[PDB]
A = this chain, B = another copy of it.
Amino acid sequence: AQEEEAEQNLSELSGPWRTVYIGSTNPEKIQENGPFRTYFRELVFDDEKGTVDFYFSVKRDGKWKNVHVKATKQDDGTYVADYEGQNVFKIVSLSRTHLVAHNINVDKHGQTTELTGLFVKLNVEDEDLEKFWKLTEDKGIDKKNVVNFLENENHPHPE
């Protein structure tokens, strides 16, 4: 018998996430204009389909791009996805607030690059949301006069 099945419930970790650090065995991949200089925005985990949808932004050729990548889990436990080549992604450490991962990428020229990363989740609690909505109602502010800054196209550029 090899290892046993892992009870996986990552669905609730879905939500807004941000990149803290990304390291690489090949500096070119994460330098300015690099394909892996990725600013995370959102992660969605589906325990039933065994997938993870990545939503992030990257600057290419002097232009900002919003990207969406779908990863599929394997018996191996790792995830595979297509993005600037083939990728084998492993979650090394995970909690309600952080994600530490290791990714192996092989580009169109067979070049292998190993990357490490630390991402943090932006947790918005129900208790705090309720406090905000009550206060907003107390001040006579209409719901239509409230702007969402977490999911908004018009935002500042990191570079």
Contact = CB atoms under 8 A, between A and B. Distances in A.
Contacts of A129: 118
Interface string A131-159: 11001100111000111111011111111
B131 A100 contact: yes
Contacts of A150: 18-21
User: How large, as a class, is the contact surface on chain A?
Assistant: 35 or more
Contacts of A158: 149, 152-153, 156
Contacts of A57: 156
Contacts of A147: 21-23, 30, 37
Nearest to A155: B39
- Which of A23, A27, A97, A114 counts the most B-chain CB atoms under 10 A from its CB? A23
A157 B100 CA distance: 25
A74 interface: no
A154 B116 contact: no
Interface stretch (A43-51, A80-88, A120-128): A120-128
Contacts of A128: 93, 95, 97-98, 100, 118, 120
9 contacts: A18-B149, A25-B140, A37-B147, A57-B156, A64-B157, A98-B124, A102-B139, A114-B141, A122-B122
Given A24-B146, A37-B149, A98-B125, 14 more contacts: A19-B149, A20-B150, A22-B147, A23-B136, A23-B139, A23-B141, A30-B145, A39-B153, A92-B135, A102-B139, A116-B136, A116-B141, A120-B122, A156-B156
